[PDB]
Design a protein around this ligand. Structure first.
Ligand code: HEM
Ligand code: HEM
Ligand code: HEM
Ligand code: HEM
Ligand code: HEM
Ligand SMILES: CCCCCC[C@H]1C(=O)O[C@H](C)[C@H](NC(=O)c2cccc(NC=O)c2O)C(=O)O[C@@H](C)[C@@H]1OC(=O)C(C)C
Ligand SMILES: CCCCCC[C@H]1C(=O)O[C@H](C)[C@H](NC(=O)c2cccc(NC=O)c2O)C(=O)O[C@@H](C)[C@@H]1OC(=O)C(C)C
Lengths: 60, 79, 241, 49, 378, 49, 378, 79, 96
């Protein structure tokens, strides 16, 4: 049982190929998860949105 | 970049030249001029001229047929 | 007249760093604009569609747009009729010529409202204070006709009538149209009529701080790595003899 | 309108000939002119959109 | 010590046109490099003076230009020098590329290639240029063309509307083009220097394609004055237009404002795109037409890969010399057809000229080359 | 971050939120006699009836 | 062989930030050269995107900007990054010149001088910049300033009206300024390269003013990454403004369109001209005021002629170190006064600060230098 | 331009260095960091700080007198 | 524009005064009428463009400043188009 960082280096960081592949694969998932958590944090500290305002106007 | 002195190797050639203030700027301008441009024109007519007359022939015939295609169109429509 | 006073710090719901506007409060504010200000105050830049994402909804915007009649494009005979109300066009209202604003309100220009919160020092608070400020002239003093009194004003001699307390309403669901409740709402809307991007701006601003919060340390640890070769380098001087 | 070999339409930019149905018949145009969403509300009126 | 050689700045200037060794040998076909330079600055220079009076906004676009021509002190010469200089910038660009093929200059890959980049950019620039006055030709010229990107599979639509700022040509499109028409000539000007940088690496080719190292002369006297005279000639021509025939090369209908309702059955891009225009529509295909239009210019970057001859210049190559002129005349053909309506004779002949063009550059000249080798016993 | 700023810059040319107008037009058919092509303006583009 | 060294293009790039030897020694005060570069491009870059939407014409000027801020997708960040980047471009310009005096960098005459030329041009540019939106500050800002040339004996009048296009600021003046505000940053960008050219002739000075030849490090790793981090910091700041405090450094009244009838008793040029503003009016003279305003900046080109010290950096010079900070604080004074109305305290103190400025740079620092020499026995 | 190898002359100096992957990027960041910035601050307060408080004093007194010049103005006007 | 060309100072004023153009608004937001300056142009016949169509049956008599440079042939086409006017031979038709 080596180290996380060790195993990480061997399988993905060593070759500049996989190294770069890792970051483009890692950026896609990051943009998504960071935008979720972020906006959520932005809403949680607010709530005078147009989100909770809609419930009132589904009609016309 | 390349400077004089580092260009290339030259063996045994003498070059005589003369001051511009000592000679004419137009030696025999017409005397020797005309004959030469005749000579250069002659030397090249046959490779330059032909494609142009070809275009020339195709240009006059091309517009011709363009008018005679419509204007000339009627023509006959007899009944 | 030469002396002046500046506004206090009303704790707006959008004064804090990452603070969104109160969309419910932007609504009531537009109402305050339409019923009251709109018959004196041009608002050349905002439109009914601008309201769509903000406060109202699709159909609602259409309806409020239809409650006026604007001069549409000329037709075949070179006409220029009138039409219900689209969504497209803005709120070009009160007067045609600018001097026609002067002919009505005695020699005074009620300036565009899209401006306002960013065109006057203090922003919302100066407009909040100027509206709910309205007080009575003490000694010395004068006034021409009805050049009303206002402390929060350059010179104290305005030409604007105090159209505050005339309790007008339509605060759907139920909201007391008191002077102060009416002033907060106009301002809150006026903030949004000047800086619509306001909330997105700060949403990004959060990400900007949150991003830099990971990057600054990182792009700094990177530079350390490379300079560490230099930082711990050891010199020795070994001259002959 | 009313130009071309098919008594419909002629686009002069690159020579596209359309018929009275708006269909492409000659020239480089790849498809028929677009027929928009429409209906007749009466014998005299037509509303497009 | 001579400061003209050791000062960081002068060096560059000494290397550019003072001490630089050049062939004792070059002829008039080498002037178009200065002329293009001159063109570029004069264009930048009148162009700027028009910008202190021009506008943008579809409402005032046309109005401002007339304002300049009628009201602005001397605005007319400026305006017309700009518009006529634009054509001259093409005559030279054309001549330059011409000189290039004939004489084999294209063997300097980087230089030639930068020059192709220089071609597309001034083309892209001049295109945006004529959209500005907002005339009839400007509107559909700006429409017929731009659209082409709508032939690109799957995403064509998206791009053409992205370059438009709407669903058609309007508001978003005139301001855009003006700004681009403003920043491009600066960028070009940079690229030019890199073009020239790579050129200094080998020095200039010459009428014989041989190699003049054995007989170089200083740019000092010689090519500076032979550039001045030359530039005077370019001035004569530019002024002849402006001062005697201002609209001779200009489509009279870019007068009369725009109108998305009209379209005046005729319409062709400015003369310098006619040969290209002819090619595109001489193909019954949206994709093929534009694909062929592209190849029509991007083929220059292909020329060096089809040099087949053992000699560099065509100075001693009758066979190729013939195919060269056949190319020129044939381009003069495409130009002429491009200028005509898509009707009877005109179609089939412009269709033949297209094939000729591509067959000549792609098969004929390369073969002429090999036969000449064989004839000489090479 | 490069994505975003670049995207935002890309989108600023795309189509100004204002240039999105134009929906339904109503045309009287009795005004267009037999054999004539009548053009109107619709969604910023020519509409033939 | 390593193509990174022999290719005509890379050479330049290798010399710029890869193999160029730099002092192992420089500190943060050397970052503002990249920051100014970054500033210059980012300014050019947002500036351009605004031009695809901006106009000119006095009628639409203000309207277009609001159009951008409200209607143009993302037009707001672009607009505000442009306006805030403009201020940052001054903070850095200011810091750069600062770093320069303290450390004696000005001993590189040509480089320093090109930098002064770089200062006046970005000043001249940013001035024209704010006239564009056509706000109140824009109009009289564009008036109070420009006029100054009317103080020039005999011909002042002529020039100010020539730069105006009329008898006041209008039609002819907004289009003019836009065009100039467009072409200048390109020209600056060129000058910058020449600035940088002359800089490479000596390499960089350093915190000790000694000479680092004995200890140079490659720009590779080292200063490229120390430039990246640095630039990130510049982004933090620029974004802090744009995204949290957009108008903090902006005069709120450039909102509300122009009006040749008004003039709002206050009016000052943008913050970065305040110190200069203070100087000019701290003199009861049309000629003297403007003459003094000029000297206020053109004195930088005088500094090297008053280097008196035997050491180059002020790193080991307490006396001068004190007069340096007195200069900075005093400039912070002029900035503050410039920002105030021409009334009671404010007049006499801004009048003292002016004298101080000129007496400090012209008499005090040069003497501090000589005394230090004498103290050291030099 | 000037390249390594043509810079200057160096006699007898050894330079030991270590791989970045072998050492810490933040040795004793706080342990040795803080003490040093205290030391550099101390080393320079006296030449940097003084002119700024001078401005500071002149700024607060300056605005003071500006208000007390007008607002305070009346004052007395008694008759 | 006519001043240097054909007419003279006073003459131009007079010809300018023989019409009545809608000048700038006044204090009440008016927009009256006034003699004729020299300053303004010849904006005449119709306001809306379609009002040109309402008069002359569905036809646009285009701007004249254009003309000589907007039509092929220039002067001669306008000269010929004016003094040309002839009568329709056989085949033919005409609407109104
Ligand atoms: C809640 C609705 C209104 C608001 C928020 C509003 C707000 C303002 C503001 C902020 C100013 C300029 C203040 C400054 O210069 O610092 C102003 C000027 C003025 N507005 Fe209003 N107003 C409103 C309704 C009215 C009405 C109903 C009238 C008609 C009496 C009116 C006529 C004026 C006039 C005459 C001025 C000129 C004051 C002056 O510059 O001397 N406005 N208003
Ligand atoms: C921005 C437009 C251009 C400018 C300003 C420009 C400038 C120049 C100059 C000054 C020269 C040297 C003088 C001469 O040979 O005439 C030159 C030569 C050359 N240029 Fe360009 N040129 C431009 C467009 C082109 C084009 C279109 C090409 C070909 C695609 C091109 C490829 C070459 C080549 C190969 C040479 C070498 C000529 C020889 O050695 O004989 N450049 N150019
Ligand atoms: C950056 C310097 C340039 C500026 C500031 C500039 C600006 C302008 C402006 C404002 C117009 C509209 C006024 C008018 O049409 O007369 C225009 C027209 C034009 N310019 Fe430029 N341009 C510049 C460089 C160029 C270049 C490099 C070319 C390509 C030779 C060019 C070719 C054109 C063309 C073709 C037109 C429209 C044709 C016409 O006037 O009928 N200009 N330019
Ligand atoms: C267009 C604005 C400017 C740009 C883009 C610019 C760019 C640069 C760059 C990249 C450096 C090297 C890195 C550094 O030392 O920070 C530098 C150094 C220098 N610049 Fe500038 N600078 C500009 C304005 C100035 C100004 C205002 C001055 C002084 C009037 C100036 C005179 C110098 C000097 C003397 C140096 C040498 C610094 C040293 O060796 O320590 N330049 N500049
Ligand atoms: C050549 C690239 C540039 C272009 C295309 C450009 C174009 C523009 C345009 C169209 C505006 C009006 C829109 C607006 O105000 O937001 C503007 C404003 C301005 N830009 Fe530039 N400019 C450029 C480079 C610069 C430079 C080098 C500076 C100096 C840092 C600069 C500083 C300004 C300033 C101060 C303003 C007005 C301030 C304000 O927005 O309130 N820009 N620019
Ligand atoms: C500002 C004027 C100073 C000149 C410096 C810039 C200009 C420049 O570099 O000058 C020399 C003159 C350069 N070469 C030649 O002219 C040239 C070279 C071989 C032969 C001939 N003639 C006849 O055999 C030539 O004329 C040339 O002509 O290139 C221009 C395009 C360039 O111009 C440019 O870059 C622009 C980007 C400015
Ligand atoms: C396009 C980007 C590629 C870079 C090439 C152009 C840019 C360029 O030449 O790069 C290097 C990086 C140049 N010098 C430095 O940065 C620099 C020099 C010593 C020390 C430090 N830092 C910390 O000690 C530096 O940062 C510098 O920073 O100058 C810029 C103004 C120039 O930028 C310009 O010209 C503009 C005219 C483009």
């Amino acid at each position: 049982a080596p180290t996380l960082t060790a195993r990480l280096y061997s399988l993905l960081f060593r070759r500049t190929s996989t190294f770069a592949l890792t970051i483009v694969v890692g950026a896609l998932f990051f943009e998504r998860a960071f935008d979720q958590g972020a906006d959520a944090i932005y809403e949680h500290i607010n709530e005078g949105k147009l989100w909770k305002h809609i419930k009132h106007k589904y009609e016309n | 970049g390349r400077q004089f002195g580092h260009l290339t190797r030259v063996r045994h050639v003498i070059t005589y030249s003369l001051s511009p203030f000592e000679q004419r700027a137009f030696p025999h301008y017409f005397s020797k001029g005309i004959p030469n441009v005749l000579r250069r024109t002659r030397a090249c007519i046959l490779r330059v001229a032909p494609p142009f007359v070809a275009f020339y022939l195709v240009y006059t015939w091309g517009t011709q047929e363009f008018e005679k295609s419509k204007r000339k169109n009627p023509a006959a429509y007899e009944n | 007249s030469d002396l002046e006073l500046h506004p206090p710090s009303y704790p707006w719901s959008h004064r804090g760093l990452l603070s969104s506007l109160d969309h419910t409060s932007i609504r009531r504010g537009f109402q305050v604009y339409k019923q009251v200000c709109s018959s004196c105050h041009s608002m050349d830049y905002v439109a009914y569609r601008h309201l769509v994402g903000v406060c109202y909804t699709e159909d609602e915007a259409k309806a409020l747009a239809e409650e006026v009649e604007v001069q549409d494009g000329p037709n075949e005979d070179g006409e220029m009729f009138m039409r219900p109300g689209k969504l497209s066009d803005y709120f070009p209202k009160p007067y045609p010529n600018p001097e026609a604003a002067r002919a009505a309100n005695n020699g005074a220009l009620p300036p565009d409202l899209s401006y306002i919160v960013r065109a006057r020092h203090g922003g919302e608070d100066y407009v909040f204070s100027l509206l709910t400020g309205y007080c009575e002239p003490p000694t010395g003093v004068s006034l021409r006709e009805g050049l009303y009194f206002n402390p929060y004003f350059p010179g104290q001699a305005i030409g604007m009538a105090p159209p505050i307390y005339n309790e007008v309403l339509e605060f759907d669901d139920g909201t007391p149209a008191t002077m102060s409740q009416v002033a907060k709402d106009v301002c809150t809307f006026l903030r949004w009529a000047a800086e619509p991007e306001h909330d997105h701006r700060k949403r990004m601003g959060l990400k900007m701080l949150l991003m830099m919060g990971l990057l600054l340390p990182l792009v700094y640890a990177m530079k350390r790595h490379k300079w560490s070769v230099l930082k711990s380098r050891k010199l020795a001087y070994r001259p002959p003899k | 309108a009313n130009a071309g070999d098919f008594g419909g339409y002629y686009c002069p930019c690159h020579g596209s000939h359309y018929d009275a149905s708006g269909r492409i018949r000659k020239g480089p145009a790849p498809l028929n002119l677009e027929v928009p969403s429409y209906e007749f509300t009466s014998d005299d009126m037509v509303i497009v959109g | 010590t001579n400061i003209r050689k050791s000062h960081p700045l002068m060096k560059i200037v000494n290397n550019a046109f003072i001490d630089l060794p050049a062939p004792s040998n070059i002829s008039s076909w080498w002037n178009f490099g200065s002329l293009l330079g001159i063109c570029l600055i004069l264009q930048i220079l009148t162009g700027l003076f028009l910008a202190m009076h021009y506008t943008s906004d579809t409402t005032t676009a046309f109005s401002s230009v007339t304002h300049i021509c009628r009201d602005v002190n001397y605005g007319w010469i400026i305006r017309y020098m700009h518009a006529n200089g634009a054509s001259m910038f093409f005559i030279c660009l054309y001549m330059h590329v011409g000189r290039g093929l004939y004489y084999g200059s294209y063997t300097f890959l980087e230089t030639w290639n930068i020059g192709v980049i220089l071609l597309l950019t001034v083309m892209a620039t001049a295109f945006m240029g004529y959209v500005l006055p907002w005339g009839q030709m400007s509107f559909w010229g700006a429409t017929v063309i731009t659209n082409l990107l709508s032939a690109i599979p799957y995403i064509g639509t998206n791009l053409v509307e992205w370059i438009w700022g709407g669903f058609s040509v309007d508001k978003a499109t005139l301001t855009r083009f003006f700004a681009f028409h403003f920043i491009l000539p600066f960028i070009i000007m940079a690229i030019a220097m890199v073009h020239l940088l790579f050129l200094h690496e080998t020095g200039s080719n010459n009428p014989t394609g041989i190699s003049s190292d054995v007989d170089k002369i200083p740019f000092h006297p010689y090519y500076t004055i032979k550039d001045i005279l030359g530039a005077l000639l370019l001035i004569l021509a530019l002024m002849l237009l402006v001062l005697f025939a201002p609209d001779l090369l200009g489509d009279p209908d870019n007068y009369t404002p725009a109108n998305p309702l009209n379209t005046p059955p005729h319409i062709k891009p400015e003369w310098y795109f006619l040969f290209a225009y002819a090619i595109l529509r001489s193909i019954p295909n949206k994709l093929g037409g534009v694909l062929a239009l592209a190849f029509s210019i991007l083929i220059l970057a292909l020329i060096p890969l089809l040099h087949t001859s053992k000699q560099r210049s065509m100075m001693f190559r009758p066979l190729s010399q013939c195919l060269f002129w056949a190319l020129v005349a044939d381009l003069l053909t495409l130009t002429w057809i491009g200028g005509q309506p898509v009707e009877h004779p005109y179609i089939t002949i412009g269709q033949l000229a297209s094939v000729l063009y591509f067959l000549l550059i792609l098969v004929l000249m390369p073969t002429a080359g090999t036969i000449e080798n064989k004839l000489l016993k090479w | 971050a490069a994505k975003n700023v670049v995207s935002q810059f890309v989108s600023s040319m795309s189509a100004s939120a204002d240039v999105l107008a134009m929906s339904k037009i109503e045309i009287k058919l009795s005004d267009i006699p037999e054999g004539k092509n009548m053009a109107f303006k619709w969604r910023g583009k020519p509409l033939f009836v």
